[PDB]
Structure 1
């Protein structure tokens, strides 16, 4: 009950910032996440004995892949924690509890392959779920872990607060299907420029929470350049692996994934930053002004990639 988590000074300070890196020590990530829940939500809203057991069962079910791993989960959780603590009044007791859990579980059991590769390989999960394949798998794995004995961190919610919270987590996890992000932002832009955006419209929150999730999931691009550049390797190791696996099915992969077309990365980083990231954080700032630091940092990194092209690094 009275068992606060504290962090080393530098961590206690830097964690509150959007561009925080959770560091190379696996064994502190669970404390960091508990710390975030206790500050973001209250010291009460999860039984520690149950949270810690959930966290470790969650960690246990992330695989040792270069990018879509346990560190990515906690990175994305952290970025969501930065948004919640800078938009304190806007979000319900439950929205805070479910979103942080949503972020931690958003990529459960990821194998390091796109929805595309599941379809062209004809993986069972592509048969069981026609769209948002991995994302429906991830939400599925979340419910499995919640139904293990001694793992129901939501135990004390009512029947209806429970279905309210499992439904926040489900749409939140689905929204990390970047194929849905594009429509979701277009509609949110159209509703902010026309002035129809209304955070009391449930279907409107849904979309906003949807985009926060895109923003949190993409937040490796909102870090300091040395973090961003070193993450870019990890995401490209999965990309080139999947390219290798496309070639094995006798399909030439998009160039993003062809490890012969390594020369073309910086241009593809530009393309990504212009098509996805700058828009996401632009629209997210419009809707949630205090999240501007994410846009600012995103822009800085786009600039850093323009210098790579221009042979200045």
Structure 2
């Protein structure tokens, strides 16, 4: 309608408000934004992806995210895809990525938490869940998110990559898997350390554009870009960041309830009777989000200085909300 179109004017911008697009799209944010992103990039024409086939795949995919989960629903997927779309345009990365790589990073973002149950890998591992048994306690949710996303591409009416070459399907699949598995927070530190090393040896053209030699370097940046997009909520406007905070805290607190019922040890940050929503965000920004975005800012300087200023401002707002 007229409201959705106005909101989509900010499709290529960090200030896009995904909750508004959700309200104006019959509550199908992921389908909406994926279609918008794909048209915007000429990806359908480039990969001969049929419009019908693409829409059907996206609606089914959206349907497999759970609507009764506070945070890990289709809104978050849609947020990570849209933010990955903006990050792919950073001036410092101009013309560095093939269209297959661009295609893989946005697809990875869309499917990256599909069928999320609203509990963490640790919880699934400690309750001897079927998912943890299937996956041997290693990146349990992430392996599953990839398995569901690639499973939906198997049926004929839903295979959006059919017109890619065999070689292209193969290379995309390797990159996608790499990206979703990189969203597993137990790998954050190794990822952050490896990204710092890549900044140290950073090489550019006269145009202030990054020089990535081989595949290894390009996928290292995409891995990190998707991970930053996933941990991007504290970098968005404060009003958006606070909506995301309430949604994740709700999900974490419902996990502390499930744990207390089962008589398990309550995880302190998931404990609604003891944890501060305000301290949780400061600690999250100081030890995880800032160190990551600071390093990303260095890689693409000064393209992300605004995001970093906003992050610092949001961190200080949460700090002031602690007495």
**Is the TM value for this pair above 0.5?**
yes
- Offset at residue 38 of structure 1 (A): 1.6
User: Could you tell me how far apart the structure 2 residues matched to 1:31 and 1:7 are?
Assistant: 13
User: Could you tell me how far apart the structure 2 residues matched to 1:237 and 1:209 are?
Assistant: 30
User: Could you tell me how far apart the structure 1 residues matched to 2:305 and 2:42 are?
Assistant: 23
User: Could you tell me how far apart the structure 1 residues matched to 2:11 and 2:80 are?
Assistant: 13
Aligned to 1:49: 52
User: Could you tell me how far apart the structure 2 residues matched to 1:8 and 1:246 are?
Assistant: 40
Give a deviation string over 1:93-152, Cα, whole Å, max 9, x none: 101111111101000100001000001101011111121100000000011111122111
Quick one: structure 1 residues 194 and 168, their matched pair in 2 at CA, closer, same or farther if it must change by over 3 Å?
closer
Contact 2:7/2:17 (8 A) holds in 1 = no
- Greater shift, 184-193 or 141-150, is seen at 184-193
- Offset at residue 8 of structure 1 (A): 5.2
- Offset at residue 74 of structure 1 (A): 0.5
Aligned to 2:66: 63
Please point out which of 204, 208, 211 is paired with 2:224.
211
- Offset at residue 303 of structure 1 (A): 1.6
- Offset at residue 63 of structure 1 (A): 0.6
Quick one: structure 1 residues 137 and 8, their matched pair in 2 at CA, closer, same or farther if it must change by over 3 Å?
closer
Normalized against structure 1, the TM-score is what?
0.91
- Equivalent positions of 1:196-275 (< 5 A) are 199-262=212-275, 264-275=276-287
Normalized against structure 2, the TM-score is what?
0.88
User: Could you tell me how far apart the structure 1 residues matched to 2:3 and 2:170 are?
Assistant: 34
- Greater shift, 273-282 or 83-92, is seen at 83-92
Question: Structure 2: which 5+ runs fail to align?
Answer: 204-209
Contact 1:243/1:257 (8 A) holds in 2 = yes
Contact 1:41/1:93 (8 A) holds in 2 = no
When the two structures are aligned, how many residues end up with a matched partner? Answer: 305
Quick one: structure 1 residues 225 and 135, their matched pair in 2 at CA, closer, same or farther if it must change by over 3 Å?
same
User: Could you tell me how far apart the structure 2 residues matched to 1:77 and 1:14 are?
Assistant: 14
Aligned to 2:33: 32
Aligned to 2:10: 14
- Greater shift, 39-48 or 75-84, is seen at 39-48
- Offset at residue 42 of structure 1 (A): 3.6
- Offset at residue 53 of structure 1 (A): 0.6
Aligned to 2:85: 81
Q: Does residue 165 of the first structure (1) align with residue 178 of the second (2)?
A: no
Q: Does residue 116 of the first structure (1) align with residue 111 of the second (2)?
A: no
Contact 1:281/1:292 (8 A) holds in 2 = no
Quick one: structure 1 residues 59 and 9, their matched pair in 2 at CA, closer, same or farther if it must change by over 3 Å?
closer
Contact 1:220/1:231 (8 A) holds in 2 = yes
Contact 2:235/2:314 (8 A) holds in 1 = yes
User: Could you tell me how far apart the structure 2 residues matched to 1:12 and 1:134 are?
Assistant: 31
- Offset at residue 292 of structure 1 (A): 3.5
Contact 1:181/1:211 (8 A) holds in 2 = no
Give a deviation string over 1:201-228, Cα, whole Å, max 9, x none: 3222222111111111112212111111
Please point out which of 177, 186, 190 is paired with 1:183.
190
Quick one: structure 1 residues 41 and 298, their matched pair in 2 at CA, closer, same or farther if it must change by over 3 Å?
farther
